[PDB]
Design an enzyme around this catalytic site. Structure first.
Site, PDB file in Angstrom:
ATOM      1  N   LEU D  38       8.204  38.355  34.468  1.00 47.29           N
ATOM      2  CA  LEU D  38       6.786  38.332  34.167  1.00 47.29           C
ATOM      3  C   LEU D  38       6.472  36.949  33.622  1.00 47.29           C
ATOM      4  CD1 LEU D  38       6.598  41.778  32.404  1.00 47.29           C
ATOM      5  CD2 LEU D  38       5.665  41.238  34.643  1.00 47.29           C
ATOM      6  N   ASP D  39       5.337  36.377  34.071  1.00 46.22           N
ATOM      7  CA  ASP D  39       4.945  35.034  33.660  1.00 46.22           C
ATOM      8  C   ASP D  39       4.515  35.060  32.194  1.00 46.22           C
ATOM      9  OD1 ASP D  39       5.396  33.904  36.290  1.00 46.22           O
ATOM     10  OD2 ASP D  39       3.470  34.792  36.902  1.00 46.22           O
ATOM     11  N   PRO D  40       4.634  33.939  31.436  1.00 48.82           N
ATOM     12  CA  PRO D  40       4.441  33.947  29.983  1.00 48.82           C
ATOM     13  C   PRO D  40       3.231  34.721  29.449  1.00 48.82           C
ATOM     14  CG  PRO D  40       4.485  31.674  30.926  1.00 48.82           C
ATOM     15  CD  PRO D  40       5.083  32.616  31.914  1.00 48.82           C
ATOM     16  N   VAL D  42       1.642  37.234  30.987  1.00 50.53           N
ATOM     17  CA  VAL D  42       1.579  38.562  31.577  1.00 50.53           C
ATOM     18  C   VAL D  42       2.345  39.536  30.692  1.00 50.53           C
ATOM     19  CG1 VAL D  42       2.122  39.906  33.671  1.00 50.53           C
ATOM     20  CG2 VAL D  42       1.552  37.456  33.862  1.00 50.53           C
TER      21      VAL D  42
END
Lengths: 130, 64, 348, 171, 97, 97
Positions: D38-40, D42
């Protein structure tokens, strides 16, 4: 109107202030904001409870998730600071002259509203504890 | 942030932008509380989650 | 006709009814088109409105003004401006730039109100960042726009994401903060950037190399104006009492300080004459102050458009017309309508 | 603990590799894996396998995900039905360019979106909630850009949350 | 320079933020290269292929236009053409047998 | 990889020092790229174009063979094929008008 806000309360929001006590606390905050004697964030309130600065800590009873501020009740009980919940975070922010909400405020004592502060302090300490 | 939610009658999250659900209650933020690894308030959270019967250990145990 | 503040400005029609659609609406400035054909207004509803110059001026009672265009944005409008080289004789020149929260820099056609172009500024992660300020170059070739620690320079001819990036802060040295306003010297080949970080910066146009860095202000700078001389310029800030006068010669320290009541986090505008003799500014109290720039600027006049904040003031480039925008943010309590207005400032 | 996993609700500031680093400090274990990045910014369902459960990470990483996101449109559309149709268009096996990394241009690739749904639309802010069920390795940021192109108004992913990681969900 | 010949790439749909979105209509459902020059049938370069998106057999592409071009110029169902060497077969993106 | 199609490049003449000299017979007298892969009609790479020489309209080329190939294998007037994109037109080498 008050009873509608009572739906939105947390599991941990006790002792909740009475309808008239809620009104007294807002008026004390307005005077303290004018005098530049409050702390607003969890970030702030947490910092000055650690330093040991006294004051009535007013919390918003509809704050979710509870993890953001649920450490503060016990921080007060460690240092015997008086704390109390009130129906809504938007009104707590509105009491400090802000459009955005806030989940906690700590009111410091001062000469200009010392009688109003002591009236609030007396009733807060008198509350039944869960 | 922008995403909110309220629970339906069968416990599923119903996502929404609006701050109030169709029954007038406030919607929660979809995102969890911000975490710090240097958090030293574990005692404090257990203390009052026990008090109000909302610690995870006191809830109904999940069916596996 | 010529400007004269020996007498109090005479009232001329304004608009109040359409702004009262939303509760707690307020104007966010007003700006004449550089030819003087029409006036553009921002508001808290995020709707840019263009009002034509009153026909009843050239034609006494005036009817309530109605805007010829309403061009809606989907988010808070940070800045907006007319094209530098606009003339109503050319449809190709008559357009309005506009920046908004988490949106591209939109270009709106000033006759039909259609979205004509979009300039897009992305960060290193390829995520869109919105410009907090806008300014066309004095040639009208380039569109300068301010961000956190950086100005971008889009070419007006080629609308898109393509842009020359100019960092104002490099290895904790230079002008820090969101660049809140850009303005170009009429004579010199330079531009001045104000920031919400207290400082002012001067930069050469062709290269973007720093010429100077100036302090002075005690709050975040919100507006800039160059004098038609080219040497002298003025600046103003939010939650800051002083309007500082500067000079490109004898630089480093502001020459004079002009007092005005600013008690909010607002862009309280101020504007010069086309001739450059008078300087007009709004106020959070409401009182529009006027100074004669021709030594320290001498106070000429103070008058009250309404019992509310006068955020916008705009002077017409040919005629003696003062425009005034009103309103501010109302703060709540636990359980007057805003307006544009025109004013004749001609002599007896 | 050595044969276990956590169905984590990832917070919104740190990267997914930072989060599993924090878990392996706390529990005092040597190995962790995490069921897809998961991107920072998200949040949502991140299966964190501990120690001997790290043998299962490929099965968890390759599983079908679900997301609830917000797309912000850069100009007005006719209404919520128009956004709902553009989502139906981007169902099935789609082309998506994988983002550039260390100046290594990865080729165009195919990823399936099983289902899409338009949950809510706000014409004021031009915000639209969408729910997407999709194959592993689908770029939802890229989906919102394409959804903006297809409408003609333009768009960006405002926000994202993963509501399912294969067998585990937020339910 | 200008290529020897050009093959049908696709047709014009709506513009989108100063580049043009186009439905892809290639023979054998071939897919263009990224940053492949897009031409009109006169062999004049209008732009380059920026995005490729949609379903495998019904996909679209955006065109980042040239310095001198404007997105308002193009009409509905106007055809665009590509150098046939910077097309690729669909089989490449389909899964391995 | 293997190209989609291949066009007639030229025919085999004598070998010369472990690479093969070939008479060029392209349509429109097109000229191959230097180090352009040379294929047999089965689309199997035999080598690469090394030298190009002779008159403009009657030119030859040598092929530097692949790792596995031998110059003895090829028969007289055996045809070789090239990917049509690494051909160039003769007009390029002819003088400017």
């Amino acid at each position: 109107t008050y009873q509608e806000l009572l739906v939105n309360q947390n599991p941990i929001a006790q002792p909740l202030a009475s309808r008239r006590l809620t009104r007294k606390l807002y008026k004390c905050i307005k005077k303290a904001v004018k005098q530049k004697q409050i702390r607003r964030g969890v970030k702030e309130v947490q910092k000055f409870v650690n330093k040991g600065e006294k004051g009535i800590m007013v919390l918003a009873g509809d704050t979710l998730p509870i993890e953001v501020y649920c450490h503060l009740p016990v921080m007060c009980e460690d240092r015997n600071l008086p704390y109390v919940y009130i129906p809504s975070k938007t009104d707590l922010g509105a009491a400090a002259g802000s459009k955005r909400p806030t989940c906690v405020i700590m009111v410091k004592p001062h000469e200009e509203y010392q009688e109003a502060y002591d009236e609030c302090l007396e009733e807060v300490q008198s509350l039944p504890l869960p | 942030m922008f995403l909110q939610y309220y629970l339906n009658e069968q416990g599923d999250r119903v996502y929404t932008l609006k701050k109030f659900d169709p029954m007038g209650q406030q919607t929660c933020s979809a995102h969890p509380a911000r975490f710090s690894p240097d958090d030293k308030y574990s005692r404090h959270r257990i203390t009052i989650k026990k008090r109000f019967k909302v610690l995870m250990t006191q809830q109904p145990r999940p069916v596996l | 006709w010529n400007y004269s503040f020996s007498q109090l400005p005479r009232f001329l029609s304004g608009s109040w009814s359409e702004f009262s659609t939303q509760p707690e609406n307020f104007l966010k400035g007003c700006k004449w088109a550089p030819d003087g054909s029409c006036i553009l207004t921002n508001s808290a509803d995020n709707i840019l409105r263009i009002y034509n110059l009153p026909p009843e001026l050239y034609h006494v009672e005036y009817a309530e003004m109605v805007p010829v265009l309403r061009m809606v944005e989907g988010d808070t409008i940070y800045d907006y401006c007319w094209y530098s080289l606009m003339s109503s004789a050319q449809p190709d020149t008559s357009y309005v730039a506009s920046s908004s929260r988490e949106n591209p820099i939109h270009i709106w056609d000033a006759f039909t109100g259609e979205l004509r172009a979009s300039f897009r500024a992305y960060n290193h992660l390829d995520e869109l960042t919105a410009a907090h300020s806008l300014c066309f170059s004095p040639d009208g070739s380039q569109l300068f726009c301010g961000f956190n620690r950086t100005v971008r320079v889009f070419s007006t001819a080629r609308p898109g994401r393509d842009c020359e990036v100019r960092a104002t802060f490099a290895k904790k040295q230079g002008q820090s903060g969101i660049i809140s306003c850009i303005a170009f010297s009429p004579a010199q080949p330079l531009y001045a950037c104000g920031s919400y970080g207290r400082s002012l910066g001067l930069y050469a146009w062709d290269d973007g190399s720093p010429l100077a860095l100036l302090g002075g202000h005690q709050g975040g700078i919100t507006h800039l104006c160059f004098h038609p001389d080219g040497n002298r310029f003025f600046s103003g800030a939010r939650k800051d009492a002083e309007l500082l006068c500067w000079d490109l010669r004898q630089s480093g320290y502001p020459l004079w300080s002009l007092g005005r009541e600013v008690t909010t986090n607002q862009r309280i505008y101020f504007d010069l004459d086309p001739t450059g003799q008078f300087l007009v500014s709004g106020s959070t109290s409401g009182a529009v102050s006027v100074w004669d720039t021709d030594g320290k600027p001498e106070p000429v006049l103070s008058f009250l458009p309404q019992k509310d904040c006068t955020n916008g003031v705009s002077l017409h480039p040919s005629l003696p017309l003062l425009a005034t925008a009103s309103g501010q943010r109302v703060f709540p309590e636990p359980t007057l309508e805003c307006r544009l207005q025109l004013w004749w400032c001609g002599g007896a | 603990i050595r044969t276990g996993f956590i169905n984590l609700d990832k917070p919104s500031n740190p990267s997914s590799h930072e989060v599993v680093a924090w878990i392996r400090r706390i529990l005092r274990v040597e190995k962790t894996g995490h069921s897809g990045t998961l991107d920072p910014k998200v949040t949502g369902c991140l299966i964190v396998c501990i120690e001997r459960a790290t043998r299962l990470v490929k099965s968890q990483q390759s599983a079908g995900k679900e997301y609830v996101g917000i797309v912000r449109l850069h100009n007005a559309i006719e209404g919520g039905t128009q956004l709902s149709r553009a989502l139906e268009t981007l169902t099935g096996a789609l082309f998506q360019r994988p983002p550039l990394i260390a100046a290594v241009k990865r080729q165009l690739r195919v990823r399936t979106i099983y289902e899409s749904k338009m949950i809510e639309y706000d014409p004021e802010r031009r915000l639209g909630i969408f729910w997407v069920s999709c194959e592993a390795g689908t770029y939802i940021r890229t989906l919102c850009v394409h959804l903006g192109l297809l409408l003609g108004v333009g768009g960006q992913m405002q926000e994202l949350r993963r509501v399912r990681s294969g067998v585990m969900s937020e339910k | 320079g200008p290529p020897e010949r050009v093959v049908l790439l696709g047709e014009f749909l709506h513009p989108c933020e100063d580049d043009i979105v186009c439905k892809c209509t290639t023979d054998e459902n071939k897919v263009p290269y990224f940053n492949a020059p897009v031409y009109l049938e006169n062999k004049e370069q209008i732009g380059k292929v920026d995005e490729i998106f949609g379903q495998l057999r019904d996909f679209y592409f955006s065109v980042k236009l040239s310095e001198n071009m404007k997105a308002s110029s193009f009409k509905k169902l106007q055809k665009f053409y590509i150098d046939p060497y910077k097309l690729l077969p669909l089989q490449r993106f389909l899964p391995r047998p």
